[PDB]
Design an enzyme around this catalytic site. Structure first.
Site, PDB file in Angstrom:
ATOM      1  N   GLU A   1       8.825 -26.035  44.153  1.00  0.00           N
ATOM      2  CA  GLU A   1       7.607 -26.746  43.765  1.00  0.00           C
ATOM      3  C   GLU A   1       6.912 -27.404  44.948  1.00  0.00           C
ATOM      4  OE1 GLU A   1       9.332 -29.176  40.483  1.00  0.00           O
ATOM      5  OE2 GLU A   1       8.314 -27.788  39.123  1.00  0.00           O
TER       6      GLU A   1
ATOM      7  N   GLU B   1      14.170 -20.734  36.793  1.00  0.00           N
ATOM      8  CA  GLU B   1      14.387 -21.721  35.725  1.00  0.00           C
ATOM      9  C   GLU B   1      13.864 -21.202  34.391  1.00  0.00           C
ATOM     10  OE1 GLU B   1      13.356 -25.157  38.912  1.00  0.00           O
ATOM     11  OE2 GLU B   1      12.965 -25.680  36.785  1.00  0.00           O
TER      12      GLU B   1
END
Ligand SMILES: [Mg+2]
Ligand code: NA
Ligand code: NA
EC number: 3.2.1.23
Lengths: 211, 210
Positions: free
Chosen positions: A69, A145
């Site tokens: 991220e 994820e």
């Protein structure tokens, strides 16, 4: 990067490991503000290069990751190529900037759904089945994820596994995540209870989202 | 008097095992065609485009049979209605292709077309190409013609594109079948079929299987 013993245990017990650089700039606006900035390349480079230098001899480590991220910046592309050059033995992956950028060998989305598209501007999350066959796309897809296991959750888990088994290039994913990040606090009688964001006077906070 | 002996079965039948009524006979048009000795024996039309389709080159290869002569010319003219949009004239004699020369009995004409109206199932824009075989001073020997649709069909990056856009094929397979006439087709039935197809949002047809 984890505590060094972790890799030794994964070598010996048998688990495949994605070793990941300590880089996350989630809170920046936009997310790649630092990672596209050549001024932050030195700092980023040390978090990648020193991980490789430490962990490269571990058989359990099968994939390198550029972090998490931090959008997609030119710094990611440079460090992607650095790893490919010094260690051809392991694929490199990175999710930021839409999960299928030029800084990743594996399409590695987070929370992309099985059949449902989520067409967010610039960083869409396609149905994983659809993603594989986008014009020009040839890479394997493994979710970095998926199946966010927050509280009473994991609804629809079987739908992922049915798809993983049917599609050769859907090669699975990593559930988010293993263990609740709750902390112990004590009541007036010394009895322990599980605490989360905000329970330590910490403010602002994101409450139970750590679990 | 013509005499035609038609066999229901042949070695050809081994390649004609379509899932349909097996019939036989002279089931399509018969005709007589008069051509001059010096004749257009073949012609191919091609349309090529720039990246945004605002320019086109119509390329027409034309073949002749008969005696070759220096006075012979081919003119390919292109028409939008009653307006001539482009024209090209050349003597016979194609470019060199190998060690033994080129095709003396062929010629290729190239016409520039600016902002061509593009053919698609959505807007079937057509031009008329007239191929005139004639003498240098303009005596017509014969003319052939065809309807020309300016369109590019290509596969790029895993997508089938018409005029640079990815097609969505709303198609149907269509046999040649009439309940009264069998496998004999007529204009009225063809037109009926096309109207019904387009009225029901079809844009494509497969000639199953011939
Ligand atoms: Mg069959
Ligand atoms: Na699979
Ligand atoms: Na969380």
């Amino acid at each position: 990067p984890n505590h060094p013993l972790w890799y030794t245990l994964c070598d010996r017990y048998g688990l495949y490991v994605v070793d990941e650089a300590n880089i996350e700039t989630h809170g920046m606006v936009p997310m790649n503000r630092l990672t596209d900035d050549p001024r932050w390349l030195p700092a980023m480079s040390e978090r990648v290069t020193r991980m490789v230098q430490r962990d490269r001899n571990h058989p359990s480590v099968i994939i390198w990751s550029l972090g998490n991220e931090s959008g997609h910046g030119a710094n990611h592309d440079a460090l992607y190529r650095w790893i490919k050059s010094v260690d051809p033995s392991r694929p490199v992956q990175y999710e930021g900037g839409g999960a299928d950028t030029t800084a990743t060998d594996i399409i590695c989305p987070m929370y992309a759904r099985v059949d449902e598209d989520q067409p967010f501007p610039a960083v869409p999350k396609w149905s994983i089945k659809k993603w594989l066959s986008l014009p020009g796309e040839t890479r394997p897809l493994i979710l970095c994820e998926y199946a966010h296991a927050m509280g009473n959750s994991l609804g629809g888990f079987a739908k992922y596994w049915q798809a993983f088994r049917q599609y050769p290039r859907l090669q699975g994913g990593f559930v988010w995540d293993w263990v609740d990040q709750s902390l112990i606090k004590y009541d007036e009688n010394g009895n322990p209870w599980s605490a989360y964001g905000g329970d330590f006077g910490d403010t602002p906070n994101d409450r139970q989202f750590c679990m | 008097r013509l005499a035609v002996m038609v066999l229901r079965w042949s070695d050809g039948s081994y390649l004609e095992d379509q899932d349909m009524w097996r019939m036989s006979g002279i089931f399509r048009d018969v005709s007589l065609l008069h051509k001059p000795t010096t004749q257009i024996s073949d012609f191919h039309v091609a349309t090529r485009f720039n990246d945004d389709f605002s320019r086109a080159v119509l390329e027409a290869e034309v073949q002749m049979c008969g005696e070759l002569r220096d006075y012979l010319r081919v003119t390919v003219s292109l028409w939008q209605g009653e307006t001539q949009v482009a024209s090209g004239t050349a003597p016979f004699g194609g470019e060199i292709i190998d060690e033994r020369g080129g095709y003396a009995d062929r010629v290729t004409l190239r016409l520039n077309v600016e902002n061509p109206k593009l053919w698609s199932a959505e807007i079937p824009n057509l031009y008329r190409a007239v191929v005139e075989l004639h003498t240098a001073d303009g005596t017509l020997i014969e003319a052939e013609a065809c309807d020309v649709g300016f369109r590019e069909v290509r596969i790029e990056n895993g997508l089938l594109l018409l005029n640079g856009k990815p097609l969505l094929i709303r198609g149907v397979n269509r046999h040649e079948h009439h309940p009264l006439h069998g496998q004999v087709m007529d204009e009225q039935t063809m037109v009926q079929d096309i109207l019904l197809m387009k009225q029901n949002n079809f844009n494509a047809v497969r000639c199953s299987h011939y």
